[PDB]
Structures are given as structure tokens and as C-alpha cells.
Design a protein around this ligand. Structure first.
Ligand SMILES: [Ca+2]
Ligand SMILES: [Ca+2]
Ligand SMILES: [Zn+2]
Ligand SMILES: [Zn+2]
Lengths: 165, 180
């Protein structure tokens, strides 16, 4: 595994998130389920817990963007960059942005929102990219298996090195 | 940062610039402040262009990338003995911008077919689409496509097709994988 400077990790175990906007590719319920599942990957193996807020300020602000979306890191249309995120901290810190010029799905087609979100949330929590193509924190997307997602050991070990099991 | 898997031909065809180069220095450059007041920096790599396979005639002397991996920042070896195959975006004359989603690999990791394909074979294939096969069964929907089967056949983006094949238009048929 690989972690960003360990000193700057989330000092509190209860974190909040908010879905700022929704891709029209899936229903609100489907988007919500994808993100809920994505956070659970991490909370299942650490003391972190996540609560979704319907409004107001949250630690992890999630949004869908097309090209220039407000920050210095514009998306690039279909394919290429799929999403990005920011390490723990104020404002942008912890936030995740998904490129809506992708087709987001709950399947093997287009790009699976849950899988990409699980990776990005890894950054939101302090993990860097892994050099192992088999790890979730590997930056190039590969559609995983057939049905049953299992957080690879390396990613478990990384996040626990930060927050404990 | 999450990136689409890409076969080298796609990378060649989609990038503004494709070069063989060596990075010799790294420097942080001030690029303003974000909406919250955080200073924005870019990393500036001073490079030596060894050869350009595609791009503007003005040689690339600088490559910019984000400081953070998490917004797709790239780290290059600045020792000066490590060569890279860099595909990326063209900025002002002599400047280039790269992200992790770009195709960037150590020159020495390239198959002989991949190195040679940079001169002309990949360009020959640009009119063909290379399509992903995330999970079987994936079909050949159209004649102008090749199906990239590396992921589902073997477990590597740089599989058999990436290393040895290009997707090029045939006479009678349209596109098909070719090893030449
Ligand atoms: Ca935040
Ligand atoms: Ca994109
Ligand atoms: Zn963004
Ligand atoms: Zn990433």
C-alpha cells in the first residue's frame, strides 16, 4: 500500500458526506446505494463511520462534473480521467468529483460508480495509489470480477495502518 | 484519481503529443489560489526530448503536472538516466501537461513492437476504434472496431494485444487486430 503524509489523517471517526448533485445516468436511489456501498468497504475494516447529510456542510462533498467544474483540474470528456478526490483536510479536503461525461452504471457497462467511488474515497481517507494492479487503490480502472466485491488485503492493510482495524 | 484503461494505440491516437524523453529536474511553480484561498502549485519538469513521434515542431522542454496523485499528478524520475514514453497534452509552444491517465511508461518496458509502432503503425490504426471488454461476453458491435480482450483473457492492461497488436483497417473487412 501507499499513504499520504500520515500526520494529516481524519482526527475524528465520525465523518459526514453529502451528494451535491446526481448523474442522470442512474436514479437517485441507485447513486445513493453505490456511495453507501463504497463507504462501507472502508468502515467495515476500521473505526470510521459515515453519515449522509441531506443538506449543509459535510466533510466529504461529492459531485458530478463535466470538464471545467469549479476547480483547477478540469475533466476531459468521455473516457480518460474518470474521477478524482482530495486527501483529508478542510474545504476540498476529502471531496470527490466524478466526470459525468462518463456513463455511470451499477453494472459492468460504462464505468461502475461503486468501484470508482470506493477508490476515490480511499483518497478522501488518506490513502495514495498502490503499485499493485490488483489493489483497489490502483489508479487504472479495471472492471472487477463477476459479482461479489472483496476489498483486497493490501487496501485493508493500508487503511488500518492509518486508522486501526 | 481513476483512469480508463487504454491500449497504446488509443493513447497515441488520442494524445496531442507523443515523445521519448528524459526528465532532468523538478521544480514547484506558483499558479495562484483556489476559491478557498489555497495556493495552487504545479510541478514543472525540465526535460530533454529524445524524439517526437507526434506533435508540434517546437521541442518540449517543460512538462507540468499536479502536485497531488489524487487529482492525477504524475511523478517522474529526475535522475537523468531514466527514459520515458510520454503521451500528453500540448500547452504553449515548448510546454506539455501530463496526468496519470496519460500513457507514460519507462521506455525500457516497451515491447519492440510497441516502440516501432510509434513511428507509423499506430497512426495507421487511428481510424479504428479499440473497444473495452469489461466482462464476457463482449461482442463486435461494428466493423470499425477491434475488441480489446487482454483484461478478460489474461489479467493485465499491457497484455498480449497491448504488446504486439494494432487495430487497423483491412480491405474487405474494416478493422481487425494485426501483429504484422
Ligand atoms: Ca471536504
Ligand atoms: Ca473523462
Ligand atoms: Zn474536480
Ligand atoms: Zn486515484
Amino acid at each position: 500500500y501507499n499513504v499520504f503524509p500520515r500526520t494529516l489523517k481524519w482526527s475524528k471517526m465520525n465523518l459526514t458526506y453529502r451528494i451535491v448533485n446526481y448523474t442522470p445516468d442512474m436514479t437517485h436511489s441507485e447513486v445513493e446505494k453505490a456511495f453507501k456501498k463504497a463507504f462501507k468497504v472502508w468502515s467495515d475494516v476500521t473505526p470510521l463511520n459515515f453519515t449522509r447529510l441531506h443538506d449543509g456542510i459535510a466533510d466529504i462533498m461529492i459531485s458530478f462534473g463535466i470538464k471545467e467544474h469549479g476547480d483547477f483540474y478540469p475533466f476531459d470528456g468521455p473516457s480518460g480521467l474518470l474521477a478524482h478526490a482530495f486527501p483529508p483536510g478542510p474545504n476540498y479536503g476529502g471531496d470527490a468529483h466524478f466526470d459525468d461525461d462518463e456513463t455511470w452504471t451499477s453494472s459492468s457497462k460504462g464505468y461502475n460508480l461503486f468501484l470508482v467511488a470506493a477508490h476515490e474515497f480511499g483518497h478522501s481517507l488518506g490513502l495514495d495509489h498502490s503499485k499493485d494492479p490488483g489493489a483497489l487503490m490502483f489508479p487504472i480502472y479495471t472492471y472487477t470480477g463477476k459479482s461479489h466485491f472483496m476489498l483486497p488485503d493490501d487496501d485493508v492493510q493500508g487503511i488500518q495502518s492509518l486508522y486501526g482495524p | 484519481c481513476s483512469c480508463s484503461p487504454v491500449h497504446p494505440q488509443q493513447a497515441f491516437c488520442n494524445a496531442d503529443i507523443v515523445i521519448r524523453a528524459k526528465a532532468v529536474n523538478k521544480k514547484e511553480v506558483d499558479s495562484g489560489n483556489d476559491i478557498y484561498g489555497n495556493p495552487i502549485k504545479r510541478i514543472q519538469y525540465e526535460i530533454k526530448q529524445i524524439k517526437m513521434f507526434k506533435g508540434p515542431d517546437q521541442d518540449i522542454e517543460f512538462i507540468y503536472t499536479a502536485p497531488a496523485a489524487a487529482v492525477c499528478g504524475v511523478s517522474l524520475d529526475i535522475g537523468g538516466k531514466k527514459e520515458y514514453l510520454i503521451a500528453g497534452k500540448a500547452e504553449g509552444n515548448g510546454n506539455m501537461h501530463i496526468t496519470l491517465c496519460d500513457f507514460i511508461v519507462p521506455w525500457d518496458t516497451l515491447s519492440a513492437t510497441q516502440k516501432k509502432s510509434l513511428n507509423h503503425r499506430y497512426q495507421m490504426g487511428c481510424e479504428c476504434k479499440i473497444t473495452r471488454c469489461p466482462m464476457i461476453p463482449c461482442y463486435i458491435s461494428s466493423p470499425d472496431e477491434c475488441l480489446w480482450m487482454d483484461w478478460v483473457t489474461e489479467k493485465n492492461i499491457n497484455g498480449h494485444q497491448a504488446k504486439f497488436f494494432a487495430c487497423i483497417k483491412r480491405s474487405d473487412g474494416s478493422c481487425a487486430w494485426y501483429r504484422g
